[PDB]
Amino acid sequence: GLLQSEELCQYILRTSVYPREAGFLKELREANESHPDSYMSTSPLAGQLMSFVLKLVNAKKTIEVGVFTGYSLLLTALSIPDDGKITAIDFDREAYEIGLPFIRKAGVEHKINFIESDAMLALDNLLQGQESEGSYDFGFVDADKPNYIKYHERLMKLVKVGGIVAYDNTLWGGTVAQPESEVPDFMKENREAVIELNKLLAADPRIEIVHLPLGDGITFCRRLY
Amino acid sequence: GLLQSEELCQYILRTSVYPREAGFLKELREANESHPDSYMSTSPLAGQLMSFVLKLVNAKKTIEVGVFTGYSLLLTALSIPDDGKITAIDFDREAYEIGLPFIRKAGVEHKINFIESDAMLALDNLLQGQESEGSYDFGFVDADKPNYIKYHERLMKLVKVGGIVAYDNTLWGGTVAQPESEVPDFMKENREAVIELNKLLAADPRIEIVHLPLGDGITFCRRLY
Numbered sequence A, B: 001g002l003l004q005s006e007e008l009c010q011y012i013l014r015t016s017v018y019p020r021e022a023g024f025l026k027e028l029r030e031a032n033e034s035h036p037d038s039y040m041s042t043s044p045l046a047g048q049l050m051s052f053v054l055k056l057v058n059a060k061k062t063i064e065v066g067v068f069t070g071y072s073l074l075l076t077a078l079s080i081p082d083d084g085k086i087t088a089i090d091f092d093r094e095a096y097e098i099g100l101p102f103i104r105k106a107g108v109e110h111k112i113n114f115i116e117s118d119a120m121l122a123l124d125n126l127l128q129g130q131e132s133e134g135s136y137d138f139g140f141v142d143a144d145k146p147n148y149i150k151y152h153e154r155l156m157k158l159v160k161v162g163g164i165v166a167y168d169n170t171l172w173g174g175t176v177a178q179p180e181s182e183v184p185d186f187m188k189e190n191r192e193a194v195i196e197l198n199k200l201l202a203a204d205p206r207i208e209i210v211h212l213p214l215g216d217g218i219t220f221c222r223r224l225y
Ligand SMILES: Nc1ncnc2c1ncn2[C@@H]1O[C@H](CSCC[C@H](N)C(=O)O)[C@@H](O)[C@H]1O
Pocket: A040, A041, A042, A065, A066, A067, A068, A069, A070, A071, A072, A073, A089, A090, A091, A092, A095, A117, A118, A119, A120, A142, A143, A144
């Protein structure tokens, strides 16, 4: 992982994360384990900060791009009020169906609008008309990393001024800091994409940011205008 | 408690932290280098999250326990509105005086009430105030680690419902996750103090928490009732 030791990571999770993690999330996280790409599920530690932030801002309307088996989606639904509404976009319905049973048992399916679609199409479609633009309290971008910069353009219209946009995987295995020659071939494409995204966000005068080493790296942005 | 490599840490600092850090904070950081215990100055990355949270909640009235040469104090002062008011407590005025010229250059001394006192004494005097309870938006506890549990008792009374209390050094050099036999003698007292503090915060029904590996570990709490 990103910390000095796996033991340190496990200490944080056991001490402060797992005891406060909803039972349904645990259940989903366990179901997820049987998936061949289980590693894609959102870090429970990153999730804990997402929850904290959602509650701090009393987020009610949110959007998630990249749902997979549903851990961040369920965490978000559990964090927001009973009347909260989430727009959840992914082109993989099969993966969503792995976490859906836990979303149902948790009593929060009513909060979720799952949109099975290419993400760019879905986001641009939402930006037609007036009911979506500037309406979201919080956005989570966790889909295909080479498209993050393009998603940022849309999220910065979808999320209201003063709202939050978070990007996952912004340290990409630590590889973004390493000399390129040390990096396995399979990691290079997203390494490049994430480096470019990080530079963009750090420079963007339209946001305040915090780039955190939680899970695989997560960056929270507040929209200034 | 830190990251897998110095390279990764320096990447985050240079890419996302230092370019957005206030000039006067850098100045203070440089002055701090001359103090024999300079290592006690707050991590700029933890600071960047502190600023983010402070702005997110529109904190105006804050309290800091453990000032040293002033990095977190100045960061807080720059984060809150012009009419913001900070109660800043430390028994070492000499260290405060190292940061004070930068606080003055920044034009924020007027926000700060520096109390040169034992921390528990200052907090208990504050609490004799008939209207002190629930008056603070944000507290930062960064003094002597064996007293963190007692400080929490006080901070839970001083900070408003929905307010935030943060504790620094909640991973104590990573030692909290190591068997005691692998830890230097001089680190053992605070290792145990922080282990117990973390257990207390994790189990406290009055708060929601997030325990983060930024700097030496920082835990943010939100008071629920
Ligand atoms: N162009 C695209 N449009 C929509 N979804 C996409 C996409 N490219 C990749 N994805 C989706 O992005 C997801 C990345 S993994 C998302 C992880 C999820 N947040 C969790 O907590 O489990 C995958 O489910 C994948 O199907």
